[PDB]
Amino acid sequence: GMQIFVKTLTGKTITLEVEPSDTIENVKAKIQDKEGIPPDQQRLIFAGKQLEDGRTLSDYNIQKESTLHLVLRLRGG
Amino acid sequence: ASALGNSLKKALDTREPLSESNFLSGHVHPHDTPIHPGANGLFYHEIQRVDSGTAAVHAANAYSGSSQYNLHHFANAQSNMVGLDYNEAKGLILQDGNDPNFVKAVLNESKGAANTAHIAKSKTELADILDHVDRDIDRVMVGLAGPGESGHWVAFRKDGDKKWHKIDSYPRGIRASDPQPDQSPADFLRQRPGTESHYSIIYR
């Protein structure tokens, strides 16, 4: 199984077990199970581009051992 | 006090598409308050359009007491730290807001009085910090996040009476008869619903 890494700007890193067909929406659900951050507060960035929930890791050419930046989404409310 | 009530209604009108030129809807108090508040007791206070995700910039200005920060500062910070394109990042902040480390980076550009940040901490330990340093500070930015939060930035400001005032830019959470309520940032944090460690503070 493929393993990706998600790294926050604070320096904390988590390893996720994912697959190429997984949607970004599915990855955010895995980050919620491990860090408790609701998916609506999550920004994932790879290669200087913010990822979209509808597409898959394969659509962005994210490969195992690739690292994703997790950035919180604090708008207002 | 009705002029403020109608200004709050204005910030609810999302008819026109959001843009770099209309995300700021108005002001509760438009005059500068770098130190003390005005004669009406109010600090500089911006009102954001409801659909804008720019709470961080408006709170940062309440933190400073003037219109010191705009989209250029936060976009430049996001481009430098995560590699986003600068023009893109300006549109993305309108949509997706600002992470606590971006805010930290923006406030520390201003050389002079230092800003102390504590990021990714529980509310209980941040409140204890705010109680420990209370006498030595007069302004705070509170980033809210985690389960039970919508994701929001609030500013706090201390007056000559040594009373704290909550300055919230989201127009749904402003009451025209008391737009800057009396509440300490420490107690504000102690009453948050979230239970994990995704809160953040920046004080001076």
UniProtKB/Swiss-Prot annotation, chain A:
Q: Where is this cross-link: Glycyl lysine isopeptide (Gly-Lys) (interchain with K-? in acceptor proteins)?
A: G1
Q: Where found, per UniProt? A: Cytoplasm; Nucleus; Mitochondrion outer membrane
Question: Where is the secretion signal located?
Answer: none
Q: How does it sit in the membrane?
A: Peripheral membrane protein
Q: Which residues carry this modification: ADP-ribosylglycine?
A: G1
Q: Where is the Ubiquitin-like domain?
A: 2-77
Modified how: Phosphorylated ubiquitin specifically binds and activates parkin (PRKN), triggering mitophagy. Phosphorylation does not affect E1-mediated E2 charging of ubiquitin but affects discharging of E2 enzymes to form polyubiquitin chains. It also affects deubiquitination by deubiquitinase enzymes such as USP30. Mono-ADP-ribosylated at the C-terminus by PARP9, a component of the PPAR9-DTX3L complex. ADP-ribosylation requires processing by E1 and E2 enzymes and prevents ubiquitin conjugation to substrates such as histones.
Coiled coil stretches, renumbered = none
Q: What does this protein do?
A: Exists either covalently attached to another protein, or free (unanchored). When covalently bound, it is conjugated to target proteins via an isopeptide bond either as a monomer (monoubiquitin), a polymer linked via different Lys residues of the ubiquitin (polyubiquitin chains) or a linear polymer linked via the initiator Met of the ubiquitin (linear polyubiquitin chains).
Q: What is this protein identified as?
A: Ubiquitin
**Portion of the full sequence shown:** 76 to 152 of 229
